[PDB]
Every structure is written in structure tokens, then in C-alpha cells.
Design a protein around this ligand. Sequence first.
Ligand SMILES: CCc1c(C(=O)C(N)=O)c2c(OCC(=O)O)cccc2n1Cc1ccccc1
Ligand SMILES: CCc1c(C(=O)C(N)=O)c2c(OCC(=O)O)cccc2n1Cc1ccccc1
Ligand SMILES: CCc1c(C(=O)C(N)=O)c2c(OCC(=O)O)cccc2n1Cc1ccccc1
Ligand SMILES: CCc1c(C(=O)C(N)=O)c2c(OCC(=O)O)cccc2n1Cc1ccccc1
Lengths: 122, 122, 122, 122
Amino acid sequence: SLVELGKMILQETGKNPVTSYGAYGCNCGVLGRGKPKDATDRCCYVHKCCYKKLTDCNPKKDRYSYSWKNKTIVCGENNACLKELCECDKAVAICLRENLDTYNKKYKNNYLKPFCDKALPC
Amino acid sequence: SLVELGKMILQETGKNPVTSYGAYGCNCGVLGRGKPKDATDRCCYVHKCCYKKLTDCNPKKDRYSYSWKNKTIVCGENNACLKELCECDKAVAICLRENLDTYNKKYKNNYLKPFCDKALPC
Amino acid sequence: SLVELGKMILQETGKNPVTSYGAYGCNCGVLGRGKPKDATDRCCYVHKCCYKKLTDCNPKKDRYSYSWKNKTIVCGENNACLKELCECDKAVAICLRENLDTYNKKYKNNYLKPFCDKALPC
Amino acid sequence: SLVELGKMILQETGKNPVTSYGAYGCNCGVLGRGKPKDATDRCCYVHKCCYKKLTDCNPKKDRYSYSWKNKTIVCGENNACLKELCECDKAVAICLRENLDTYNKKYKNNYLKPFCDKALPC
Ligand SMILES: CCc1c(C(=O)C(N)=O)c2c(OCC(=O)O)cccc2n1Cc1ccccc1
Ligand SMILES: CCc1c(C(=O)C(N)=O)c2c(OCC(=O)O)cccc2n1Cc1ccccc1
Ligand SMILES: CCc1c(C(=O)C(N)=O)c2c(OCC(=O)O)cccc2n1Cc1ccccc1
Ligand SMILES: CCc1c(C(=O)C(N)=O)c2c(OCC(=O)O)cccc2n1Cc1ccccc1
């Protein structure tokens, strides 16, 4: 769920998911995909494509278990959908950390929302 | 201060410092040094010796700054006491994480109140 | 920003950046690039080309942190743009020092403005 | 003179000579030699011994010339006493930089006369 996702983002990046990624670019924290504005935005674009493959479980509200071992996210062996859901959130946490260097303050808090292009298919 | 120390332990080990290390063995959390019970206890033994050589500041109360970059603790530059105080806290966070493999709840002071021998000098 | 740049130039060259480089040649301190009149001028040409690559921050007005360690300018860790900015400024301060030998006061005070040719592209 | 000495210290160490070294340990910035408290203090003890040999001039008062060339203090030529005086000052500026790693503001007198033993002779 968003509980697990937010904890992974903070564990990997050290940032509050809401204040830093609540509405960044055309994809991060908002509903629906748009053409990404930068690399951080593209992380959330891929993550939304990860989610849409997952029927038989609810990515937004379904809880799951994971552990933080050797400063690494380790998805607990689980249901197929829950395991894949955990691997979706782990990928976007790593992706957001990796692109902190080009994180741009001008893209937060839905400054880009009126300018967002229609997204290409996943 | 204990504020920064607590966040480093959380970021490195993934554990709550109060529940996991608030009173563990003969050195972790408790006041004063004793002969260590295991590898985790020895981390806190070393950390307490690290604090002992700091005289120009109050290790428990004085605040400093540090960064979480690439899942690594990076101490902020400061005067001798505050910088070395940050380094004391960093080494114990890494040490406790490295020794999670042998962390044993039997050394938590709430499971069994350990009999602690007089510590050797630092 | 110019505050950090001016301190670097003083630290490296020992010269006041305003009085020595406020309007030197066809590139130093003045607006716009021109064909360099000497090696000092070319330092500022390269520096202006360095700035032109930076589009995610404001090279003239954005602050950054650096320190003086072992008589070396050491750029503090930041985002990609601010780190590249600091490295642009460190490089021009260093370049200006290396070419103090051929510094010509005849090129000061924007005397060469009618002599400035179109520069080669960056 | 002290004017040239203070400029050297700022150039080499990056520190304000008054606020960092104006009364530090048993030798730095105070009158007379004492048993050094640490490596920084020892730099000032050695420097005071350097001044002791300069009888043909006035170390604190007499001016001399030096240049900041390639981030090196270069004493200008002069008579024996004044050239030796500049080299005394250059040496203490270098010594203080080299020992910034163990600088500790705990040794600043802060207008309380510390316990100072009689120094070894020189
Ligand atoms: C970038 C972080 C993010 C999402 C992403 O990781 C992302 N934009 O992909 C996301 C999200 O995405 C899933 C989806 O769109 O269904 C939906 C809703 C909020 C979303 N926050 C913000 C957040 C998450 C967890 C705790 C606190 C804040
Ligand atoms: C192992 C964690 C620890 C200490 C150590 O790291 C350790 N035992 O060395 C320590 C401590 O030690 C310093 C000293 O003895 O002055 C004193 C008091 C509490 C101490 N907690 C618990 C804690 C720290 C920070 C936030 C919340 C809880
Ligand atoms: C050569 C020094 C210099 C610039 C350069 O280093 C240079 N010509 O590249 C520069 C400058 O250049 C950046 C740009 O044109 O955007 C713009 C404005 C002033 C500029 N001073 C003068 C100065 C710098 C810092 C403090 C005080 C005076
Ligand atoms: C450590 C710096 C220092 C002295 C030394 O370098 C040192 N303690 O040797 C020293 C000093 O020493 C020479 C002597 O006692 O005759 C005498 C007086 C002040 C002295 N400041 C402080 C200072 C010097 C220059 C400008 C501003 C502040």
C-alpha cells in the first residue's frame, strides 16, 4: 500500500514522500500518467506502468511485508501479486534516490500540472 | 545529541533505537560502561569510550548536522567536539547494523536484567 | 553566486576580483563572450561557456557551499547544477591564477571593447 | 610585523588569526612561552623560539615584504633579520594549517589564564 511505498522512499532517499514527491512533475504523487518532465518524473511513470499490470490485488491499499537488511529493501516472500507489488515500490524508491541529483524544485506542488502532455502507452 | 544518534541508528539498522537498543546488554542505552555481553553490546562499549574523550561539548544534548547521501551517513563540518561527536554516532550506527546477525533479545534489559561486570578502561 | 566566485578568485590569485577582473579583455566581468585577447581573457571565456551549460540553476545568483581545505577550494556536496556551478567557479579562479604572469593592465577597464571579435563557439 | 603574520595565517589556514589563535593554549597569541598543550600550541611555541633569535630587528613591529604566489608564501629578499623574521612567520602559518586536524577550541583561554608549565629552554 501507500504505507509501505512511503517507508521505502524515506528509507532509500531520506526524503518525506509527501513533501518531496507528493506532486512532482507529471507523474509523481498524482493520478494518471503524463510525459515525464525529468528523470525523477520518469521513475514515477514507470512505477505507474508497474502498477497497472497488477490485477488480483489492489496496489494502493493492500498491505504487504518487507524488511530493511544491509541497507537494502527485501520484499518478503508473498502472494504473486503482493510480491510483484512490493517489487514495484522497491524499484521506484531506488529510482528516486538515484535521481536526487537532478531533482528540480520548480517541478513540485503541481506547477507542471497544466502543462502535462498525454502519455505514451506503457 | 540523542536526537541525531537515534535517526542514524534508524537509517542504518532499520530499527527503532529505543525498542531495539534502549537497554541492551551492559552498554547499549544504559548509563556507564560494563564488560560487553556480545558484539552488539561491544558497539555501544566503543561508542561510550568515543563520548568519553569529548570534553568541549555535551554529547547527549548538543546538536549537530549530518546528511543521508547514497544510503551513507555524511557528517556535517563543525568544530572539533561536534564533528567528532557526529563521528562517534556514525560508527555506532554502522557497528550495530553490522552486528544485527547476532542481535539477541535475551540481552534486552526487559527480557533479562544482566549482571554487568566492571568495565576495563578505554 | 558572484559572492562565492569573488571569494574564490581572492583566495587563489590574491587579487580583488572587481578591481582586477571587473572588466578585463573581451570576456572577464563584461557581458557576452568574445575572441580572447590573452590567456587571462580565455579563462573567462571558458567560464562563460561553463555557465552556458547550466540551465537548472541560476549561476549568477544561486548560493552554494565550499570550503578552504589544504589550501584547496573544495566544493560542498549539492545537486548536479550547484556542484557544476561551484566547479565552474573553482576552475576560473584557478585558471586566472595560472595566467597572472601575462596579466596586462592595458586590457583592464574595458578598453578593448571596440577591439573585441566574435568568439569561436563553445 | 603582526600585520604580515596575520595575513599569512588567514591565507594558509583560512582562519581569522584573532578568533582562532588569539589566545590558544599556553603559547598562541599570548605573551611568553609555556609547555605546549597540543600540536597547534607547539607551532606557536616554536614560532616564539624563532623570534628569540631575531635581535637585530623587532619581530612584532617591523614590516617586511612577501607575496602570495601559487598559493605559497614567498618571502621577499631583505637583510638577515627581516628575511629570517618573514620565514619565522611563514613557518608558523604552515604549521598551524598542518595541525588543523587536531585544533580544538577547548584550549582557547577565553580570558581565563590556563595552567601553563615552564617551557623547555630555547
Ligand atoms: C512518488 C511517490 C508517490 C507515488 C509514486 O510512486 C508514483 N507517482 O508512481 C504515488 C502514487 O503512485 C501510484 C499510482 O499512481 O497509482 C499514488 C499516490 C501517491 C504517490 N506518491 C506519494 C506518496 C506515496 C506514499 C506515501 C506518501 C506519499
Ligand atoms: C544504542 C543506542 C543508545 C546509546 C548508545 O549508542 C550507547 N549505549 O553507546 C545511548 C547512550 O549512550 C551514550 C552515553 O552513554 O553517553 C545514552 C543514552 C541512550 C542511548 N541509546 C538509546 C537511544 C539513542 C538515541 C535516541 C533514542 C534512544
Ligand atoms: C573575471 C571575474 C568575473 C567574471 C568571470 O569569471 C567571467 N567573465 O567569466 C564575471 C562574470 O562572468 C559570469 C557571466 O558572464 O555570466 C559575470 C559578472 C562579473 C564577473 N566577474 C567579476 C567579479 C566576479 C565576482 C565578484 C566580483 C567581481
Ligand atoms: C597564533 C597567532 C599569533 C601569534 C603566534 O604565531 C605565536 N603565539 O607564536 C602571536 C604572537 O607571537 C609572537 C610573539 O609572542 O612574540 C604574538 C602576538 C599575537 C600572536 N598571534 C595572534 C595574531 C597574530 C597576528 C595577527 C593577529 C593575531
